[PDB]
C-alpha cells in the first residue's frame, strides 16, 4: 500500500497516514504536562538524563517564545527548536506591526497554520513535534494551548504530551485546577510527573518546571531552585 | 441480458436466503458451535491422560519359536471419538462454503479505484479458503486412519513373526486420538477466527466501495 | 539499474548514458578526416538520394567560419544546433578579441557545450561526434575530434560513425608522410578510405577540402567522379 | 492500479479517485453538520463533541465568522478547516477593499471553491479534506445557504447536511421541504435540531450542539448561547 | 478472407445469443432446481446409520455378491448430470468471454482486466468442478478395493468400517457438491451480470479523435 | 504500463493516453446538445439534481462569455468554471485591444490554446471537460466544440456526455440545415429526451439560444412552454 | 527493461524511443501530400473528419498559410499543430520586422525544427507529435517543398506524402512523377491519382479532400484553395481518364 | 556465408510455412468449425440418457455360498472415440504450425518498439495453452482403455464385488461425457485461434512496424 | 591464473573448434536437415491416412465361453518409423548442446551495464534450453512406447477375456504413429527456429558488449 508514503496522498478510506505516523513521533518523547489555574499556567517536563556526561540545564524542552509566553515541547527536538524560532518570529512581527504583545490564541493559530502548511505538500514532511504554549495577561487571563503535528489547536485547562499522556491526563483530571493557585500547582505537577515516570524503563529524570502568571507579573520564567527542591521533595514523599 | 420476471424472482430469493443464512451462521450457529466444542473438549473421553490406556487389544497368536487369526475389531475409543468429531468437520466445511459464496456475492462491480474494499474481501475469502483446505486435510486424515489401521493389522496378521507391525497398530491408534483431539481444538479455533475476521471487517465486507 | 540517469555512477564508476550516446554516434553515416601538409580533407558518406529528395538540404559538412569547418556523425538535429551555436561563438569570439578563432578554441567550446549537457539530468547528451578541421594562424593543419562525452583529441587522421573501426584500421595501414605529400593524394586517400565502407563510390560520398587561405570547397560530383576514376584505374 | 495516489492522473474511466477519497476524509471525523434555510433566517447546526474534560469547551468550535454578516460551519479535518476559514476571511476582506461592498455569500463560496479546484488540478498539494457551508443574508435574494466541497462544486441549497449522517439527514430534510408550508425562525431552528437529533439518535443536551443563525432582522452572524440552545431544545421536547 | 470471418461471426453471434439466454433463464432456473434438490429429504439425512449398506461377507470364528449402496448410487445418478451440465455451461461462457477479448492495444487496458478477472474465477470453477467429476469416479473404485480387501482378509475388522465410511463420506461430499454447483451458478451469474458492460464491450465505442 | 500514468509520455503506437482518459471523463458527464439553426443556435443540457434541496438558481451549466457568445459543457464542473472565467477574461482582453466583440472562432481558438497549455506540463492534469461554444457573429451562427486535448471542431449539430453517440445519430437523422431555431429547440429537447432516464421538467434541463440579439438563457417558464409540446 | 520514457534517456543501441513513438502517431493521421512543379507547388490532403454534422467554416482544416509566400499542411496532433503554426507565423513576422524582407522558406522550417529538437532534448516536455509539409516560393531557390518530423529533422522533397498510407503514396509518386516535366495541372492529376489509391473510399468525395496551390502571378505569390467545383472537375477528369485506360484493355 | 542451396532451402521453408499458415487460417478453420458443429448436431454426440450407452457385462454373478467369456468394449463410446481422435491430432498439428509461423515472424531482438513482440508472445502463450489442453485430451483418450481394462479384469477376478462392475459402466459414462466435451472445446479452440490471430494479425506479421523517418 | 603454453593451446583449440563447428552447423547442417526432415514428412509412410493400415495382428487366442499365445511381434511400421526418427532426435539434442556451449563461451565478463547484448544471449539461451527439454521429452516417450506396449500385450495374454487390453495395444500403436509424425514436424521446426533466432541476432550474440568506446576514461 503506497498510500502511507506521502502526506499529499489520501488513503482510500479518507485518512492521511503520514500525519498519524508523525503523531506517533511525540509518544516516543518523555512526558510533559502543563496545567492552568486561576493565577497562571505552570509547565513541567520530565527530562530524562541520558548520560551523566551531559550538563545540567541542557536539552531544555521549555523555551521562552516571548517575554509573556512560554513553550513546552514533545517530539523531535530539532523540529521543536525550529518551531520555537518560528513562534518567536511571529511574536516579534506581531509586536512590530500591531504594537503590543501577541495574544496567545492568535500565536497558537499562526504557528498551527505554519505547521498545517507542511501536511499538505508532498515535498516536505509534517513536523515531528507536539508542543504546549502558555501565557498570562491581565486582560486575556491564563491561557494554555496545545498544537499537534497536524496543526490542530485547542485550549486546555490541563494538558499532557508524550509517552505517558493518558496516565498523566487522568492524574491531572483528578486535580480541580480552576480554584487552585500556582505555588500549589507546581507541587502537584511534580507529583504527576514523578508518578508517570517509569523507573525501570527510564533510568533517571531531572524535573524541569516553568510557569507564567501574576506572580511573575506576566513573564514566563524558570522556577527558582528553592521552589523546585520543595516540589521535588513533596513529590518524592507523596510517591511512597 | 433480458431478465424474466420468474428469473428475477429466483435470483432475488437466492440472494435473500444466502444473506439471511450468513447472518444466522455468524450470530446464532457459530457461538453455539463454539460452546459445543468447548464442552466436547471438557468431556473426559477427549482428554485421556494416558494414551497407553486406549491401546487396543490385538489378539493374533505369537508364533511359537523354531494357527489362525480370529476377528480383530477396531478400537472402540477412537471410533467413538471419530463419531463425535466427523459431523463437526463436515459442518464447518459447509459453513465455509456459505461464507465464501456470501462474500463473493458481496464483491461489487469491477472498477479502477476504491479497491481497498475488494482487497479486504479478497483477504477474508483467502483466509476462509485456507480454513477450508485445512478442514479437507482433516477429512483426509480421518479417511486415512481406517485404511492405515487395516493395512497394519492385516500386515501383522499375515506376518505374525514381526512384532513391529503390532506396535505400529497401537501407534496408529494413539496418533489417531491425538489428531482427533487436535481436530476438535482447531475446529473451535477456526470457528472463532472466522467470527473475528468477519466481525472486524464486516463494514468493508458488506460495503467495500464506500457508500 | 544504473543506466537510467546520467548523474548516477554505476558500481565500478561507469556513466552509462553517455556511453549509450557514444553508441548512438556509431549508427550515423561515416565521416573521415585527414591532415595533408597544406590541405585538410573532410569526407562524408551520403545515405541515399531517394529520387524525390533535394540533395542541397542535407549536407553533413558545414563551415563554422572562414577558417574552420566540421563534419558530424550522429543525430542530425543535434548537429544542426551545435553547428549554429559554434558559429555564433565564432563570430562572438571575433567580436570580443578582434581575431579569428583557432581550431582548438572552437573544438573546446563545442566540447564544453556537450559536457554541459552531460553533467546535468533533465538534459540528454548531444548524440553527435564531430570532426573539426581548420588552419591556424601559423598555417599548420589541424584536425580535432569530439564525442558526446565532451573529451576532444587531435588526430592526424580519423573517422567517425558506422564502419569507423574498419576505415580507421585501413587508414592506420595506409596513412604516411608519402600520402600527405600531394593534395590530390590526400583527397584520393580519403576517397579510398570511404570506398572501404560504402555501397558505391561516386554517388555516395560528399567530400570537401580546405586549403591554406581559401574558403571551404565542396568538390563537384564530376571532380569526385574523376578522382574515383583515377583511384579505380590504378588498382 | 496506481491510478489513485496522485490527484493529477485520470483513471481509465476518468474519475480522479483522490478527490473522492478527500470526500471520505470528511466522514472520518465522525461529526455531522446541518444547514436549513427559512423565509427570513438561515441556521447552521453541528455536533460539538469534547473528547476530554480538560479541553476548554469555549475553544473547540466548528462555527466561524468569515465576516460580520457571513458565518460558516466546517466539517472535516480541523486544521484544513481552520486554514480554509482563514483564506475565506482574507478573500472577504480583500473583496471589500477592492470593490467597496461586502462580499456576497455566493461569490465567497465561488472563490473558495475555485481555490479548491486549483488544489485538485496541481500535483504537489492535496485537496483540503474539509467541507464548508456558508450562511448569510443578501438584500436582493434574502437568506442564502451554500456549500463548498473538496472538488470545487459550490452549489447553493435550500437545506443541506455534511458529515457521516449526510444521506440520512438529507433524506429527512427532503421530506420536510416536500411538505412545504413555511419556515419562520423558530421552525427553522427546530427543523435543524430535529434533523440532527433524529439521524444521530442523540436526543441532545445544550452542550452537545452549537448553533449559529442569521436573520433579515439582525443580519450579523451570531452563535447562540447555551441558554438559547436549551430554550429551543426544551420547546422541542414539550411539543 | 471475409468468408472465414463471416462463418466465425455466425458462430460468435450464436454464442452471444446462447450465453445471453443461458444467463437469462438457465442459470436462475438451475439455481432454483439445485436448491430444491438440496432441500429434498434424500440429500439431508438425520442418521447415516440408515445410509449404512449391508456387507454379507462372512465373519471368521467365496462371499456372496456384495452390492453398491443403492442410496449413494441413486444420489450419484441424479448428481452426475448436474456436474456435466454446469461444466458445459461454464465452457460455453468461457469461450464467449475469450471471443470478446479485444485486439491487444497499449491503451484502455481496463475492460481487458475485467475480462481477465472474470476469466480467473471461471478457471477456478472449472478446476473445482472437474475435481468433483473425478471424485464421483474414484468413489466406486475405492469402495470396490475396500470390499475386496475385506474378502481377502475376513478377520480384519476395520475394512468393513472403511467401506461404510467411504459410503458416508461420499454422501456428505455429494451434498457439498450440490451446494457448490448451486453457488457456482449463482456467482457466475452475479459476476457476469455486474460486469456485463465491460465484458461485452471492453474498449468502448468512444473515439477521441485527437488525431 | 508507464504510458498510462504519465501525461508527457507517448505510449507505444503513439497515444497520449491520459488525454483519452480525460475524454472518457467527458463522456461520463451529463448530456449536452448543440444545434446550429439558420437564424440561431441552441445549447441544451440536463441539469438533473440529486434532490429537491438543491436550489436551481444558484448555479448554471450554461454561461455567457460575452453578449453574443455562450457555452455549455459536459464533464467536470470545476474545470468548466476555471475556463469560463478565463474565456470571459480573454474576450475582455480582445475588446480592450481591438474595441470589437471577439469572434466566436477566435475565442474557441484561445480557450483551446489554454487547454493545450495545460496538457504539456506534468505537474498539471488536463481539463476533464469539453465545451460547446456557440456564437453569432457577422450575421451568421456558429457552433464549436473544444475537447480536453486542446483541439476544436465546428459542428452543425452535435452532442456530448452520456449516450453522445446515440444522440448524434438521432440528430443526423433529424437535422435539416433549413431549420429555424423555433424548431431547433424542439429537436434539441428531443435529442436530450432520448437519454434522460427520467421525466424531464423545466428545472431538470437548462437551455440557451443565440441569435442576432445575442446569447440568452430562456427562463424556466419559457422552457416549460417549449416542453408542453 | 524500459528505456522508453522521459524522452531524455538514450537506450542501449543509442535510440530515443519517445520520438520514435511520436513518429508512430503521425502515421495514424490523415494523409497529406505535396508535389513540386515547374510553375507552382501544391498541397493536397485528405479531410479525415468526414462526420456528416461538421461545418467547413474555416479556410482549411489541414492547410494553413504561414506567410504571404508560403503555406503548410499538418499531420499529427491538432493541438500541437496549432501551437506550431502560431509559432511559425510569429517567426516569419519577426524576420519581416527585422530585415523587412519575407522569411526564407528553409529558414522558417529550420527555426521550427529547432523548436521541435529542443522539446526532444529537455526533460519535462514531450516531443511534438506532428509532421507537416511546407510549400513556398523564395527569391533564392524559387519554389520549394519541405517536410518535417517530430525529431526536428527536415528535408527538401520534389514530392512526398505524410500520414496514413504514406509508403503507398511515395511508391506511386516515384513511378509517376516526372522530374523537370510537371506542370500544376499534371501535378493536380497525379495528386488525385495517389489520393484515390491511398484513401480507402472508392470515390474521392470532393468533400473528403482539400487541395491548395501556390503560384507566382504578377510578381506576387498567391495561395489558393481549389473550390469544390474545381476538385469535382478534377476527380471527374481522373475517373474518365482511368476508365478510358480501362476501356482500351 | 550461406550457400545458394542453403539460402534457397530456408527461403522455401519460410514461404511454405507462410502459405500453409494462410491456408489453414482462412480455409481450414472455418471448415473444421462447421464440421465440428455438424458432429455436435449428430445424434451420437447428443445421446441424452446414458443408461442407453451402458453396455452389458457378462461376467458370471457368483452364487451365494466358471470363467468369463470374451468381454467386449462398449461399441458406442469406441465409435465416438474413432470420430473424435483424428480431430484432436489434427488440431495439435495445426497449433504446432501456428507456433512455428509466429516464431518465424518474431523479429530481431531489439530494445524498444517491443509492443509487437509482446503481442506475439501473448498469442504464443495462448496457442501453447491450447496445445497443453489438446495433449491432455490425448492422454485422457489413451488412459480410458487402460483403466476400463483394469476395471473389467478386476470385476472378473472378483465376481463377488459389484462395485467394479458399476465402475466399468461409470467409466463408459464418463468417457462419453468427456468425448462430447472434447469435441465442444476443439470447436472453441479453433475459433479462439482464429479470433486472436485475425484480431492481432497486423502486429503478428509486422511487429516492429513501418520503417521510420530515420533521425540518423 | 598462471597458464602453461600447452594449457593455453588446449583451451584455444577447444574454443576454435567450438566456433568453427557452430558456424558450419548453422550455415550448412541446419538447411540440409531442414530439407531432409521436410522430405521425410512428405514421405508416404509418415502420411498414412487409414490408421487400420498401421494396426498389426496380436495372436492372442480369444477365449471361447465355457491354449497359449505365440510370439507377439512389435509393429513393423512403427518400429521402422522409430528407426528413422531416433537418429534425428539424438542429433538435434547434440546440436542444441553445441549451440548452448557456443553461446555460453561467447558470454562476456560480467559487467554493470551495456547488458543488452548479454540479455539477447540469455534470451536465445532460454529458447535453446526450451527445445532441449522438448527433445528430451521426445527421447523419453519413445522408450515409454515400448515399455507400455509390452505391458499391454502381457496383460492381454494374461487376461484373454478382457478385449480392452487388445484395443489398448492397437491404440498405443496408433497414438505412437501420431506422436512420431508430430515429432518429426517439431524437429524440423526446432532446427528452423534455431536458424532464425541465431541468424537474426548473430551480431549481438558474437559481440554482445560491442565495439570499443571512444574511452572518455
Q: How was this structure determined?
A: cryo-EM
Between I164-200 and H115-157, two packed helices, what is the crossing angle to 10 degrees? Answer: 160
Cell readout for D3 is: 491510478
Give how far H102 is from chain F: nearest CA, Å: 21
Pairing label, strands C31-35, C40-45: antiparallel
Distance between terminal CA atoms of chain C? 52
Give how far H130 is from chain I: nearest CA, Å: 16
Cβ contact E24:B3 at 8 Å:
yes
**CB–CB of B101 and E183 under 8 A?**
yes
Q: Helices H, strands E: what count in chain B?
A: 6, 0
Strand partners, F69: F135
- Residues of chain B neighbouring A13 (CB-CB closer than 8 A): 116
CA-based nearest residue to E40, from E75, E69, E68: E75
Domains of chain C: 16-234 (3.60.20.10)
Whether the CB of D28 is below 8 Å from some CB of chain B: the reply is: no
For residue C36, the SS3 value is: coil
> For chain I, which chains pass the contact test of at least 3 CB pairs under 8 Å?
C, G, H
As a whole number of angstroms, the distance between CA E86 and CA A20 comes to: 51
CA-based nearest residue to H59, from H170, H145, H154, H171: H154
Supply φ then ψ for residue G65, to 5 degrees. Answer: -95, 120
As a whole number of angstroms, the distance between CA F138 and CA F155 comes to: 18
| F and D interact (at least 3 Cβ pairs within 8 A) | yes
Cβ contact B124:B107 at 8 Å:
no
Whether the CB of G112 is below 8 Å from some CB of chain E: the reply is: no
Strand partners, F163: none
CA-based nearest residue to A47, from A167, A192, A147, A193: A193
What letters, b where the CB count within 10 A reaches 16 and e where it falls short, cover I1-37?
Answer: eeeeeeeeeeeeeeeeebeeebeebbeebbbebbbeb
Q: Name which of E36, E96, E156 to mutate to probe chain B: the one with the most chain B Cβ atoms within 10 A of its Cβ.
A: E156
Pairing label, strands C53-54, G154-157: antiparallel
| F and I interact (at least 3 Cβ pairs within 8 A) | no
Q: Which candidate from E59, E158, E196 shows the least CB-CB separation from B150?
A: E158
- Residues of chain I neighbouring H102 (CB-CB closer than 8 A): none
- The helix (H) or strand (E) run that includes residue F206 is strand F205-210
Give how far I117 is from chain G: nearest CA, Å: 9
Cβ contact F3:G122 at 8 Å:
no
Whether the CB of E109 is below 8 Å from some CB of chain D: the reply is: yes
As a whole number of angstroms, the distance between CA F87 and CA F66 comes to: 9
Q: Any idea how long chain I is?
A: 217
Domain that holds residue H110: 1-216
Domain that holds residue G143: 17-248
Pairing label, strands A40-48, A205-213: antiparallel
What letters, b where the CB count within 10 A reaches 16 and e where it falls short, cover A130-148?
Answer: bbbbbbbbeeeebbbbbbb
Contacts of H200 (CB under 8 A, 6+ apart): E103, E104, H119, H123
> For chain A, which chains pass the contact test of at least 3 CB pairs under 8 Å?
B, D
Cβ contact D34:D212 at 8 Å:
no
Distance between terminal CA atoms of chain E? 29
Cβ contact B54:B77 at 8 Å:
yes
CA angle C109, C110, C111 (to 5 degrees): 90
**CB–CB of D11 and B211 under 8 A?**
no
Please, is H65 exposed, middle or buried when counting C-beta atoms within 10 Å of its C-beta (0-12, 13-18, 19+)?
exposed
Cβ contact A119:A23 at 8 Å:
no
As a whole number of angstroms, the distance between CA G162 and CA G28 comes to: 10
- The helix (H) or strand (E) run that includes residue B87 is helix B76-106
As a whole number of angstroms, the distance between CA D157 and CA F58 comes to: 8
Contacts of G116 (CB under 8 A, 6+ apart): C77, G84, G127, G128, G130, G148, G150, G151, G152
As a whole number of angstroms, the distance between CA C141 and CA E151 comes to: 110
- Helices marked H in chain D: 17-27, 78-99, 105-121, 166-178, 185-200, 226-238
Handedness of CA H115, H116, H117, H122 (dihedral sign): positive
Cell readout for A212 is: 507564567
Contacts of D218 (CB under 8 A, 6+ apart): none
Cβ contact F128:D151 at 8 Å:
no
Cβ contact F8:F112 at 8 Å:
no
What letters, b where the CB count within 10 A reaches 16 and e where it falls short, cover G67-101?
Answer: bbbbbbbbbbbbbbbbbbbeebbebbeebeeeeee
Q: Is residue G70 part of a domain?
A: yes
**CB–CB of F14 and G28 under 8 A?**
yes
User: Which positions 28-57 of E are in contact with F (Cβ < 8 Å)?
Assistant: none
CA-based nearest residue to D144, from D89, D194, D107: D107
Please note each residue after which chain E is broken, C-to-N distance over 2.5 A, or write none.
61
- Helices marked H in I110-214: 116-158, 164-200, 202-206
As a whole number of angstroms, the distance between CA C133 and CA C149 comes to: 20
> For chain B, which chains pass the contact test of at least 3 CB pairs under 8 Å?
A, D, E
CATH code where residue G199 lies: 3.60.20.10
As a whole number of angstroms, the distance between CA F130 and CA F48 comes to: 18
Whether the CB of I65 is below 8 Å from some CB of chain C: the reply is: no
**In this structure, what DSSP letter does residue D207 have?**
G
Q: Which candidate from H110, H112, H213 shows the least CB-CB separation from G23?
A: H213
Nearest CA in chain I to C147: I214
Amino acid at each position: 500500500t503506497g498510500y502511507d508514503l506521502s502526506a499529499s496522498t489520501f488513503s482510500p478510506d479518507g485518512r492521511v497516514f503520514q500525519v498519524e505516523y508523525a503523531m506517533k513521533a511525540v509518544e516516543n518523547s518523555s512526558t510533559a504536562i502543563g496545567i492552568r489555574c486561576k493565577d497562571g499556567v505552570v509547565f513541567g517536563v520530565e527530562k530524562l538524563v541520558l548520560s551523566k556526561l551531559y550538563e545540567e540545564g541542557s536539552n531544555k524542552r521549555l523555551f521562552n517564545v516571548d517575554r509573556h509566553v512560554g513553550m513546552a515541547v514533545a517530539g523531535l527536538l530539532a523540529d521543536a527548536r525550529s518551531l520555537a524560532d518560528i513562534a518567536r518570529e511571529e511574536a516579534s512581527n506581531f509586536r512590530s506591526n500591531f504594537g503590543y504583545n501577541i495574544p496567545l490564541k492568535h500565536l497558537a493559530d499562526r504557528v498551527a497554520m505554519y505547521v498545517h502548511a507542511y501536511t499538505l505538500y508532498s515535498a516536505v514532511r509534517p513536523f515531528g513535534c507536539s508542543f504546549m504554549l502558555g501565557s498570562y495577561s491581565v486582560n486575556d487571563g491564563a491561557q494554555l494551548y496545545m498544537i499537534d503535528p497536524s496543526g490542530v489547536s485547542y485550549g486546555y485547562w490541563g494538558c499532557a504530551i508524550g509517552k505517558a499522556r493518558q496516565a498523566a491526563k487522568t492524574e491531572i483530571e483528578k486535580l480541580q485546577m480552576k480554584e487552585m493557585t500556582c505555588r500549589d500547582i507546581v507541587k502537584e505537577v511534580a507529583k504527576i510527573i514523578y508518578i508517570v515516570h517509569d523507573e525501570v524503563k527510564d533510568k533517571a529524570f531531572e524535573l524541569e518546571l516553568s510557569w507564567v502568571g501574576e506572580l511573575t507579573n506576566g513573564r514566563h520564567e524558570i522556577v527558582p531552585k528553592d521552589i523546585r527542591e520543595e516540589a521535588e521533595k513533596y513529590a518524592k514523599e507523596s510517591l511512597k | 441480458v433480458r431478465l424474466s420476471g420468474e428469473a428475477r424472482k429466483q435470483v432475488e430469493v437466492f440472494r435473500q436466503n444466502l444473506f439471511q443464512e450468513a447472518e444466522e451462521f455468524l450470530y446464532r450457529f457459530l457461538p453455539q458451535k463454539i460452546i459445543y466444542l468447548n464442552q466436547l473438549l471438557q468431556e473426559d473421553s477427549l482428554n485421556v491422560a494416558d494414551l497407553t490406556s486406549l491401546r487396543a487389544p490385538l489378539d493374533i497368536p505369537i508364533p511359537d519359536p523354531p494357527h489362525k487369526c480370529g476377528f480383530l475389531p477396531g478400537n472402540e475409543k477412537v471410533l467413538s471419538l471419530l463419531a463425535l468429531v466427523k459431523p463437526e468437520v463436515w459442518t464447518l466445511k459447509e459453513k465455509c462454503i456459505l461464507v465464501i459464496t456470501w462474500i463473493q456475492h458481496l464483491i461489487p462491480k469491477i472498477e479502477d479505484g476504491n479497491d481497498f474494499g475488494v482487497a479486504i474481501q479478497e483477504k477474508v475469502l483467502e483466509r476462509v479458503n485456507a480454513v477450508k483446505t485445512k478442514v479437507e486435510a482433516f477429512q483426509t486424515t480421518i479417511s486415512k486412519y481406517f485404511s492405515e489401521r487395516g493395512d497394519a493389522v492385516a500386515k501383522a496378521s499375515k506376518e505374525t513373526h514381526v512384532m513391529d507391525y503390532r506396535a505400529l497398530v497401537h501407534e496408529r491408534d494413539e496418533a489417531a486420538y491425538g489428531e482427533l483431539r487436535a481436530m476438535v481444538l482447531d475446529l473451535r479455533a477456526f470457528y472463532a477466527e472466522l467470527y473475528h475476521i468477519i466481525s472486524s471487517n464486516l463494514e468493508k465486507i458488506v460495503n467495500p466501495k464506500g457508500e | 539499474s544504473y543506466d537510467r540517469a546520467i548523474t548516477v555512477f554505476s558500481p565500478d564508476g561507469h556513466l552509462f548514458q553517455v556511453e549509450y550516446a557514444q553508441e548512438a554516434v556509431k549508427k550515423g553515416s561515416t565521416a573521415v578526416g585527414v591532415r595533408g601538409r597544406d590541405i585538410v580533407v573532410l569526407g562524408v558518406e551520403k545515405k541515399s538520394v531517394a529520387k524525390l529528395q533535394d540533395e542541397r538540404t542535407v549536407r553533413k559538412i558545414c563551415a563554422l567560419d572562414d577558417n574552420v569547418c566540421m563534419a558530424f556523425a550522429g543525430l542530425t538535429a543535434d548537429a544542426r544546433i551545435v553547428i549554429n551555436r559554434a558559429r555564433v561563438e565564432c563570430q562572438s569570439h571575433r567580436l570580443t578579441v578582434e581575431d579569428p578563432v583557432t581550431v582548438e578554441y572552437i573544438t573546446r567550446y563545442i566540447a564544453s557545450l556537450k559536457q554541459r549537457y552531460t553533467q546535468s539530468n533533465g538534459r540528454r547528451p548531444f548524440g553527435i561526434s564531430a570532426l573539426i578541421v581548420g588552419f591556424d594562424f601559423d598555417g599548420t593543419p589541424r584536425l580535432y575530434q569530439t564525442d558526446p562525452s565532451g573529451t576532444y583529441h587531435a588526430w592526424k587522421a580519423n573517422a567517425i560513425g558506422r564502419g569507423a573501426k574498419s576505415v580507421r584500421e585501413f587508414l592506420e595501414k595506409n596513412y604516411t608522410d608519402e600520402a600527405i605529400e600531394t593534395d590530390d593524394l590526400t583527397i584520393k586517400l580519403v576517397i579510398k578510405a570511404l570506398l572501404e565502407v560504402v555501397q558505391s563510390g561516386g554517388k555516395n560520398i560528399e567530400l570537401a577540402v580546405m586549403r591554406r587561405d581559401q574558403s571551404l570547397k565542396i568538390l563537384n560530383p564530376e571532380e569526385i567522379e574523376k578522382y574515383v576514376a583515377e583511384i579505380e584505374k590504378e588498382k | 492500479a496506481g491510478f489513485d495516489r496522485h490527484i493529477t492522473i485520470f483513471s481509465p474511466e476518468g474519475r480522479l479517485y483522490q478527490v473522492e477519497y478527500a470526500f471520505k476524509a470528511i466522514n472520518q471525523g465522525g461529526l455531522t453538520s446541518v444547514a436549513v434555510r427559512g423565509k427570513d433566517c438561515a441556521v447552521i447546526v453541528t455536533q460539538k463533541k469534547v473528547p476530554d474534560k480538560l479541553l476548554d469547551s469555549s475553544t473547540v468550535t466548528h462555527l466561524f465568522k468569515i465576516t460580520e454578516n457571513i458565518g460558516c460551519v466546517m466539517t472535516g479535518m480541523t486544521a484544513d478547516s481552520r486554514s480554509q476559514v482563514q483564506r475565506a476571511r482574507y478573500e472577504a476582506a480583500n473583496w471589500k477593499y477592492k470593490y467597496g461592498y461586502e462580499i456576497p455569500v455566493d461569490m465567497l463560496c465561488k472563490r473558495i471553491a475555485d481555490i479548491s479546484q486549483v488544489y485538485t488540478q496541481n500535483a504537489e498539494m492535496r485537496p483540503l479534506g474539509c467541507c464548508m457551508i456558508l450562511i448569510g443574508i443578501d438584500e436582493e435574494q434574502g437568506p442564502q445557504v451554500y456549500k463548498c466541497d473538496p472538488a470545487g462544486y459550490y452549489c447553493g441549497f435550500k437545506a443541506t447536511a455534511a458529515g457521516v449522517k449526510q444521506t440520512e439527514s438529507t433524506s429527512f430534510l427532503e421530506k420536510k421541504v416536500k411538505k412545504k408550508f413555511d419556515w419562520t425562525f423558530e421552525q427553522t431552528v427546530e427543523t435543524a435540531i430535529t434533523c440532527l437529533s433524529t439521524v444521530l439518535s442523540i436526543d441532545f443536551k445544550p452542550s452537545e450542539i452549537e448553533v449559529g443563525v442569521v436573520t433579515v432582522e439582525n443580519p450579523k452572524f451570531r452563535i447562540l448561547t447555551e441558554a438559547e440552545i436549551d430554550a429551543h431544545l426544551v420547546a422541542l421536547a414539550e411539543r | 478472407q471475409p468468408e472465414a470471418q463471416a462463418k466465425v461471426d455466425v458462430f460468435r453471434e450464436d454464442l452471444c445469443t446462447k450465453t445471453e439466454n443461458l444467463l437469462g433463464s438457465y442459470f436462475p432456473k438451475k439455481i432454483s432446481e439445485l436448491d430444491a434438490f438440496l432441500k429434498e429429504p434424500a440429500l439431508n439425512e438425520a442418521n447415516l446409520s440408515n445410509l449404512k449398506a449391508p456387507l454379507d461377507i462372512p465373519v471368521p470364528d467365496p462371499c456372496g455378491p456384495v452390492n453398491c449402496n443403492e442410496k449413494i448410487v441413486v444420489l450419484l445418478q441424479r448428481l452426475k448430470p448436474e456436474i456435466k451440465d454446469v461444466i458445459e455451461q461454464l465452457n460455453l461462457v468461457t469461450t464467449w468471454l475469450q471471443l470478446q477479448i479485444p485486439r491487444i492495444e497499449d491503451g484502455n487496458n481496463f475492460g481487458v482486466a475485467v475480462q481477465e478477472k472474470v476469466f480467473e474465477l471461471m478457471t477456478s470453477l472449472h478446476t473445482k468442478l472437474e475435481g468433483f467429476h473425478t471424485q464421483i469416479s474414484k468413489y466406486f473404485s475405492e469402495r470396490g478395493d475396500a470390499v475386496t480387501k475385506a474378502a481377502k482378509q475376513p478377520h480384519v475388522g476395520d475394512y468393513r468400517q472403511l467401506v461404510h465410511e467411504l459410503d458416508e463420506a461420499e454422501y456428505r461430499d455429494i451434498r457439498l457438491m450440490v451446494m457448490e454447483i448451486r453457488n457456482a451458478y449463482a456467482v457466475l451469474y452475479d459476476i457476469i451480470l455486474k460486469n456485463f458492460e465491460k465484458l461485452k464491450k471492453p474498449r468502448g465505442e468512444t473515439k477521441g479523435m485527437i488525431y | 504500463r508507464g504510458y498510462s500514468f504519465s501525461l508527457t509520455t507517448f505510449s507505444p503506437s503513439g497515444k497520449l493516453v491520459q488525454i483519452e482518459y480525460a475524454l472518457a471523463a467527458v463522456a461520463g458527464g451529463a448530456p449536452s446538445v448543440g444545434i446550429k439553426a439558420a437564424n440561431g443556435v441552441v445549447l441544451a443540457t440536463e441539469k438533473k439534481q440529486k434532490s429537491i434541496l438543491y436550489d436551481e438558481r444558484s448555479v448554471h451549466k450554461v454561461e455567457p462569455i460575452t453578449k453574443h457568445i455562450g457555452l455549455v459543457y459536459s464533464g467536470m464542473g470545476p474545470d468548466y468554471r476555471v475556463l469560463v472565467h478565463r474565456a470571459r477574461k480573454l474576450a475582455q482582453q480582445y475588446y480592450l485591444v481591438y474595441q470589437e466583440p471577439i469572434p466566436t472562432a477566435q475565442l474557441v481558438q484561445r480557450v483551446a490554446s489554454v487547454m493545450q497549455e495545460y496538457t504539456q506540463s506534468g505537474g498539471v492534469r488536463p481539463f476533464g471537460v469539453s465545451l460547446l461554444i456557440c456564437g453569432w457573429n457577422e450575421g451568421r451562427p456558429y457552433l464549436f466544440q473544444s475537447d480536453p486535448s486542446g483541439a476544436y471542431f465546428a459542428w452543425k449539430a452535435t452532442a456530448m456526455g452520456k449516450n453522445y453517440v446515440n444522440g448524434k445519430t438521432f440528430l443526423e437523422k433529424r437535422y435539416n440545415e433549413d431549420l429555424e431555431l423555433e424548431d431547433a429547440i424542439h429537436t434539441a429537447i428531443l435529442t436530450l429526451k432520448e437519454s434522460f432516464e427520467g421525466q424531464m421538467t423545466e428545472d431538470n434541463i437548462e437551455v440557451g439560444i443565440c441569435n442576432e440579439a445575442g446569447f440568452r438563457r430562456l427562463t424556466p417558464t419559457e422552457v416549460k412552454d417549449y416542453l408542453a409540446a | 527493461r524500459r528505456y522508453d520514457s522521459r524522452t531524455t534517456i538514450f537506450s542501449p543501441e543509442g535510440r530515443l524511443y519517445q520520438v520514435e513513438y511520436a513518429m508512430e502517431a503521425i502515421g495514424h493521421a490523415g494523409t497529406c501530400l505535396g508535389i513540386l512543379a515547374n510553375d507552382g507547388v501544391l498541397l493536397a490532403a485528405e479531410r479525415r473528419n468526414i462526420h456528416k454534422l461538421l461545418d467547413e467554416v474555416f479556410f482549411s482544416e489541414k492547410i494553413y498559410k504561414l506567410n504571404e509566400d508560403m503555406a503548410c499542411s499538418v499531420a499529427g496532433i491538432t493541438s500541437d499543430a496549432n501551437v506550431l503554426t502560431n509559432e511559425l507565423r510569429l517567426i516569419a513576422q519577426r524576420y519581416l520586422l527585422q530585415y523587412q524582407e519575407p522569411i526564407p522558406c528553409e529558414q522558417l522550417v529550420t527555426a521550427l525544427c529547432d523548436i521541435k529538437q529542443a522539446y526532444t532534448q529537455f526533460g519535462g516536455k514531450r516531443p511534438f507529435g506532428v509532421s507537416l509539409l511546407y510549400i513556398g516560393w523564395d527569391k533564392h531557390y524559387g519554389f520549394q517543398l519541405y517536410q518535417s518530423d517530430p525529431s526536428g529533422n527536415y528535408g527538401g522533397w520534389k514530392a512526398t506524402c505524410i500520414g496514413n498510407n504514406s509508403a503507398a503514396a511515395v511508391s506511386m509518386l516515384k513511378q509517376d512523377y516526372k522530374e523537370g516535366e510537371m506542370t500544376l495541372k499534371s501535378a493536380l492529376a497525379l495528386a488525385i491519382k495517389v489520393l484515390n489509391k491511398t484513401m480507402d473510399v472508392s470515390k474521392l468525395s470532393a468533400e473528403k479532400v482539400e487541395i491548395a496551390t501556390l503560384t507566382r502571378e504578377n510578381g506576387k505569390t498567391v495561395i489558393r484553395v481549389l473550390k469544390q467545383k474545381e476538385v469535382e472537375q478534377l476527380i471527374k477528369k481522373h475517373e474518365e481518364e482511368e476508365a478510358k485506360a480501362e476501356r482500351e484493355k
